[PDB]
């Protein structure tokens, strides 16, 4: 009502902005009395299919509410090999979750003119190359003997999905992951230019927010890249494949750590024959 | 009321081994303002577990089997409920297969166990 | 001959899509916003978890159709709406 020019009054709320601290602690999602949480102890588990090594816990492990795009920071690590999970490979629109076995450490630092909208991030080269080598081995195990040409840049669109957006110290860092993904694959350290931006798109809902100007001094963000989020390119008539990073749907962050679990109801009452 | 998990260790094994594990794992498994809120939430967990246990004992109270871990009633099987040699029952099946198999007879058995207290 | 034998403690599951409570052990003396949230909206830990490893069972999990993701998603919506209060919001209505 009524009927195509539905009244979209873009409302606005003004609240106070105290500069807050911010560091996510782990969270254990327990199940109440009468329920139980199953768990897959198979180290090479897809995400679907039968898991034969089911155990039962009351409450989950430590899950950090870490919000980020294109890279899964401070997550958990696969036990044996780099795992690749998707709702539907061949869909070319579903986010390929790539979980690592070793943490690739990243240092996002804002030093102290001092150009408050500027920071940089360092990824240890030749630790990163080994990780992409293992990822391309698993992707060839899915796809065959293709050339991964290339891990491209982000295709564009919104600012928070084009760049490695994350939060650190209450300040929102939008990096530039273009140099970290550029390699074709036939069969020292990297500096990432990472600004600080303050007219943000909310991920909670559809909206925009404005935050306070940045903080006094040195910001340290010692982290672990324990994941990726990739997409693909459909077509065409073999050819080579191109894996642009993506993300933004934050539930893909929570199908990487609530991956092993399932909630069941315990019904303890049964009937049977006798020989009474 | 944390012994609901100890029931589940006998899944996958057959019905006789689970019936032994019943008795075995039953005998073996037995001032700041922001802190009073934790005390109240832990009590709301514990009292809820006690009330769920008492409701589960009251549903065994209708059938004359309250408190008993295993009881043997007086409702004879119409043998159109798993017409099966009971060696194959207690040796070749698990409990999940029973909850699948006699699922269309279970309300009938509950009605008979209620009606055989009168 | 043979007749009904009511048991109790039978290992039988179902599925559920229910309420499911947080969390770990916060500090309850800090001004870190996750610690303030986990104080005012969650319970402490229990130092003795009970991981019962099962016998030869075979469950079929499905990661992409899990009702646990939406629930912690709603909890983190609450965390981020209570911690990082923005200066100006612009959210539409479209009534």
């Amino acid at each position: 009502k009524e009927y195509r020019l539905i009244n979209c009054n873009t409302s606005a709320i003004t609240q106070a902005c105290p500069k807050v601290s911010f560091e996510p602690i782990p969270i254990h999602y327990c199940a109440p009395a009468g329920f139980a949480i199953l768990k897959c102890k198979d180290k090479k588990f897809n995400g679907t299919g039968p898991c034969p090594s089911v155990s039962t816990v009351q409450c989950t492990h430590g899950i950090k509410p870490v919000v980020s795009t294109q890279l899964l920071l401070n997550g958990s690590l696969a036990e044996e090999e780099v795992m690749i999970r998707s709702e539907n490979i061949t869909n070319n629109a579903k986010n390929i979750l790539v979980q690592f076995n070793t943490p690739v450490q990243i240092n996002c630092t804002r030093p102290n003119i001092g150009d408050i909208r500027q920071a940089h991030c360092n990824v240890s080269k030749a630790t990163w190359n080994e990780t992409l080598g293992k990822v391309v081995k698993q992707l060839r195990k899915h796809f065959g003997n293709n050339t991964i040409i290339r891990f491209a840049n982000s295709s564009g669109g919104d600012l928070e999905v084009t760049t490695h957006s994350f939060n650190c110290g209450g300040e929102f860092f939008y990096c530039n992951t273009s140099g970290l993904f550029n390699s074709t694959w036939i069969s020292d350290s990297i500096t990432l230019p990472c600004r600080i931006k303050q007219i943000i798109n909310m991920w909670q809902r559809i909206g925009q927010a404005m935050y306070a100007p940045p903080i006094q001094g040195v910001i340290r963000c010692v982290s672990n890249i324990t994941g990726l989020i990739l997409t693909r390119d459909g077509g065409s008539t073999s050819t080579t494949e191109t894996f642009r990073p993506g993300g933004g749907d934050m539930r893909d962050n929570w199908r990487s750590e609530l991956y092993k679990y399932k909630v069941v109801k315990i019904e303890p009452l049964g009937v049977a024959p006798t020989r009474c | 009321g944390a012994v609901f998990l100890g029931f589940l260790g006998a899944a996958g094994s057959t019905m006789g081994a689970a019936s032994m594990t019943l008795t075995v794992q039953a005998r073996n498994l037995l001032h700041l303002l922001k802190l009073t809120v934790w005390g109240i939430k832990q009590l709301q967990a514990r009292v809820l577990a006690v009330e769920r246990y008492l409701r589960d004992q009251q549903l065994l109270g209708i059938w004359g089997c309250s408190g008993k871990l295993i009881c043997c009633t007086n409702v004879p099987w119409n043998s159109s409920w798993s017409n099966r040699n009971l060696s194959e029952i207690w040796d070749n099946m698990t409990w999940l297969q029973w909850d699948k198999e006699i699922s269309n007879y279970t309300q009938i058995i509950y009605g008979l166990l209620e009606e055989s207290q009168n | 001959n043979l007749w009904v034998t009511v048991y109790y403690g039978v290992p039988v599951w179902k599925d559920a899509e229910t309420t499911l409570f947080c969390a770990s052990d916060a500090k309850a003396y800090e001004t870190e916003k996750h610690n303030v949230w986990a104080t005012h909206a969650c319970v402490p830990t229990d130092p003795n978890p009970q991981e019962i490893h099962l016998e030869n069972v075979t469950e079929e999990f499905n990661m992409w159709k899990n009702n646990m993701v939406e629930q912690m998603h709603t909890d983190i919506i609450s965390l981020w709406d209570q911690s990082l209060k923005p200066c100006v919001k612009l959210t539409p209505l479209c009534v």
Partner: antibody
Amino acid sequence: QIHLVQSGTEVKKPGSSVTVSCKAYGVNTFGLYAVNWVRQAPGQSLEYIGQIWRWKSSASHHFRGRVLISAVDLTGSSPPISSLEIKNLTSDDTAVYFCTTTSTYDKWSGLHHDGVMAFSSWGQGTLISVS
Amino acid sequence: DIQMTQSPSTLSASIGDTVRISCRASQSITGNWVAWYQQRPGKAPRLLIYRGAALLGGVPSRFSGSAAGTDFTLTIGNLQAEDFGTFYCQQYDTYPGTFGQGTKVEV
């Protein structure tokens, strides 16, 4: 929305082998689902052949040693493919073949009883004649 | 296995006629492990009813089923023109499953 598609009509020689494809559009994976191969002689009733439930290939006792049933999951650029190979053909295997898939995700469904299944979704028919 | 016996082997009825088709097992199937299929000619047989009386999702609710241990009764009310095809009853109780014979409903 399973839109299971098979191969086309084929004819072979006796004492030979044959292979029938089964591409499973709209199937998550064969870990969750299960493929039951079944056949039908012309005019007769439907005769079971075999299955690959939980990646365990197994055929019935009439067909042991003669039939191979293989499967490859949804990897990359191709949907999940099941495939039926028959060795040492006789002139009594001229029949319409079917691959079927049913969901084994829910234990309390009723479509399946410990690996013995009702056939909830069907192919379209692969006729093999033997000359 | 456990042989089924479908009855009758051939009938015919008109539009709007309640049709009862029985299927008798050689054993007693306590657990209702009987499916029911409809095959139109030149097509693949779709599933109508599993577990004796559980109705599938994409099926019109005209049908009904019943199970009595050995007798399995399929009942069509308000029969239509689309529902004219060879039926089948399946026992999926014990491995391997085997099917019925075919009740070719005509006019």
